[PDB]
Amino acid sequence: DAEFDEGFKVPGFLFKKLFKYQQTGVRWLWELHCQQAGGILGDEMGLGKTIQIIAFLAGLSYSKIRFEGLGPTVIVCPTTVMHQWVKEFHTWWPPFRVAILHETGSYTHKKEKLIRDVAHCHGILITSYSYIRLMQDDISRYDWHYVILDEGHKIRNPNAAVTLACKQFRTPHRIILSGSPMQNNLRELWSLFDFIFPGKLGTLPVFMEQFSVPITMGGYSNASPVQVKTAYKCACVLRDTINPYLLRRMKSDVKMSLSLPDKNEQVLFCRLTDEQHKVYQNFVDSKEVYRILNGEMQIFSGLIALRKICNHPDLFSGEEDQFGYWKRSGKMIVVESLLKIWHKQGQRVLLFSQSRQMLDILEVFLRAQKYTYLKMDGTTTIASRQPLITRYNEDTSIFVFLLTTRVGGLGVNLTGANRVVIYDPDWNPSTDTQARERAWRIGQKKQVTVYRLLTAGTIEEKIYHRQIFKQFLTNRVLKDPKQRRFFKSNDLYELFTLTSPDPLASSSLLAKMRARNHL
C-alpha cells in the first residue's frame, strides 16, 4: 500500500495501476483535502481524470480518515458520460454504491427517495447538470462530502442557473474535472475558481479590473509595449495565484511516460464552390448584412447564415440534385475525397459537426455512399449513447462515427476511431479541442490525425482567427505568460466580407518586489 503524509492509504493493487502523473494527482487531491480547499484537475482530455478521482475516493474511504472515511458524494457530469462514470467506478472500486439520478437511472421510484438513500448510505450520486439546476431544492439539504463536477467548465457562465445551483453546496471539497478550464475569457476562470474556492479570485468586478482588462488588453495587436509588460505582470500574478489549485498536465510532459502514438493537427483550407461562392457573395451583398453593419439588427442572423452557407447551401435548396447534395459544397467534396482515401486505407474516421442539420446532410451523403456509419447527436436517447460508443469501439466494421461536438465531444472515449475530421469550426476553441481529443486518448493504439476543415476567405477562417486569439489568451495564463501577441488580425466587425483566395530573508522577497514593479 502507498502511505501518504498523515493517514491516507490507497490500496497497493489500485495504486499500481495508476501512472506516475495520476498518483501525483491523487497526492495533490489529498493535499487539497487536508487544506479543505477545492481544485481543478486541468489535465487535458484523455490523460485520465475519472481514474484519478476514483482512486482518490477509494483511498479516502479505504483509509477511514460527521463522515468516517468517505461521506455521500455527488458527481455532476454531462448526460452522455454518466454511465461511463458508473462503469469506471464499478471496474476500479466495486465496493462503492454508485447510483444515477436521471430518467434513465436504475431506481424506478421517486428520485427524492434516491437522493435521500444515497445521502444516508454514503454512496455516490451521479447526476446531470440539468438535474442539479432542477433539483437544487433537494440536492442541497443533505450535507454532501464531495461535489466533483466532471467537465465543470459548464459552470463557466457566472450567471447561469446551473452555476448558481452548483455554488449552493456547503462542503469545502469542490472538485472540477475539465481539461480546458478556460474557453473564451478570464470570466470563465473566475467562475470556476469561485466554485472551487470562493475567495482566491475576489469579487467578479475586482477580478475584472485587476486581471481581465490588463491581461486581455495586452494581447491585442495594437498593444503598446508598456501595456504588454503590464499584461505580463498580471498574468504572472494570476498564475502564481491559481497554481496550488490548478493541476494541468499536458500530453507533452506525459506522452513519453504513457506511450501514446503520434499525432497530427493539419488544418485544410477548403474552397467554396461556384454555387456556394455565388450564394455567399449574394448574401454579403444583401441588405440584411448592410443593416447589421449599421447596428440596426443583431449580428446573429448574418453570422448563422454565413456559417450555414459555408457548411452547405441549405438556404436555397437546389436527379442527383436533392437537398444536401455533396458536390455543391467544397468541404463536402474534400470530405468525400478523405473518406475514399481513408476507407481504402482500412481506417476508422470520426466526423464532427457543430450543426445538427449539417450532421443530417453528412448522414445522407454517407448513405449515398456505401459507408457504414453510426450517428450520435443531441436527439439520440441518452441511455443508448454509451452503448453506441462501445459499439463503435468494439467492431471495426463501422467506418465513420458522426457526431455533434457538444455531445460527441465532452468526455467520451472513442479510441476505436483512428482519423478525426472537424467539419465546421466553432466560436469556442475548446469545443473543437475536446472533439479532436476524443480519439487521442489512453488506449489509442494507432497514429491519429486531426483534419480541421475551414473555407478559405469565408466567415469560417475569421472564426478560426477568433478562436486562435482565444487560445492565445488562454495559454497566456495556463502554460506561460510570454505568449506572442495575436497579429494575424485586429478582430473587428468586418467578418461579413468574402475574400476567397487566388522564512524568506527579506531579500529574495524584496528582489521579487523590485523585479515585478520594473516589468
Partner 1 sequence: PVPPLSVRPAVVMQGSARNQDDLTHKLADIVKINNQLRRNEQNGAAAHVIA
Q: Which residues bind Mg ion (CB under 5 A)?
A: 50, 411
- Which parts of 113-172 interact with partner 1 (CB under 8 A)? 158-159, 164, 167
Q: How far is the CB of 389 from DNA (least distance, A)?
A: 14
Which is closer to partner 1, CB of 190 or CB of 373? 190
**Burial of 365 from C-beta contacts in 10 A (0-12 / 13-18 / 19+):** buried
Q: Does 301 bind partner 1 (CB under 8 A)?
A: no
Which is closer to Mg ion, CB of 177 or CB of 335? 177
- Which parts of 383-442 interact with DNA (CB under 7 A)? 383-384, 404, 406-407, 426-428, 431
CA distance 484 to 298: 33
- Which parts of 355-374 interact with DNA (CB under 7 A)? 355-359
Q: Does 124 bind DNA (CB under 7 A)?
A: no
Q: Does 244 bind partner 1 (CB under 8 A)?
A: no
Chain center to CA of 250? 14
Chain center to CA of 351? 17
Which is closer to partner 1, CB of 43 or CB of 194? 194
367 phi/psi in degrees, rounded to 5: -65, -30
Q: How far is the CB of 243 from DNA (least distance, A)?
A: 26
Contact partners, residue 168, CB within 8 Å, separation at least 6: 136, 140
Compute the CA torsion angle 126, 127, 132, 135 (nearest 10 deg).
-100
Region label for 117, one of left (φ > 0), alpha (ψ between -120 and 50) or beta (otherwise): alpha
Q: How far is the CB of 140 from DNA (least distance, A)?
A: 17
Q: In what order do the strands lie in the sheet with 400-404?
A: 263-264, 448-452, 419-422, 349-353, 400-404, 373-376
- In the shown chain, the binding pattern of residues 96 to 115 toward DNA, with x for contact by CB under 7 A and - for none, equals ------xx------------
Q: Does 203 bind partner 1 (CB under 8 A)?
A: yes
Options 2, 34, 37, 134; binder of DNA; rule CB under 7 A: 134
- Look at the block and give the residue holding cell 467520451: 412
SS3 127: strand
Q: Is 43 known as a binding-site position? A: yes
- Which parts of 28-87 interact with DNA (CB under 7 A)? 78-80
Q: How many residues bind DNA (CB under 7 A)?
A: 50
Q: Which helix (H) or strand (E) holds 239?
A: helix 225-242
Q: Is 48 known as a binding-site position? A: yes
Q: Is 135 known as a binding-site position? A: no
Cα 402 to Cα 148, 356, 367, 410, 435, distances in angstroms: 30, 10, 12, 15, 12
Q: Is 68 known as a binding-site position? A: no
CA distance 69 to 46: 29
Q: How far is the CB of 255 from partner 1 (least distance, A)?
A: 40
Q: Does 205 bind partner 1 (CB under 8 A)?
A: yes
Which is closer to Mg ion, CB of 181 or CB of 411? 411
Which is closer to partner 1, CB of 192 or CB of 358? 192
- Which parts of 176-235 interact with DNA (CB under 7 A)? 183-184
Which is closer to DNA, CB of 337 or CB of 381? 381
- Which parts of 477-506 interact with DNA (CB under 7 A)? 491-493, 495
Q: State the Cα angle at 364 between 358 and 366, rounded to 5°.
A: 105
Which is closer to partner 1, CB of 163 or CB of 428? 163
Closest CA to 441 of 255, 274, 272, 314: 255
Q: Does 117 bind DNA (CB under 7 A)?
A: no
Q: Supply the DSSP string of 362-426, one letter for each residue.
A: HHHHHHHTT--EEEE-TTS-GGGHHHHHHHHHH-TT--EEEEETTTTSSS---TT--EEEE-S--
Question: Contact at 8 Å (CB) between 297 and 291?
Answer: yes
Q: How far is the CB of 414 from Mg ion (least distance, A)?
A: 12
Query: Residues in the site for DNA, rule: CB under 7 A?
Result: 78-80, 102-103, 128, 130-131, 133-134, 156-157, 160-162, 183-184, 297-301, 303-305, 355-359, 377-379, 381-384, 404, 406-407, 426-428, 431, 462, 466, 491-493, 495
Question: Known binding site for ATP: residues?
Answer: 43-50
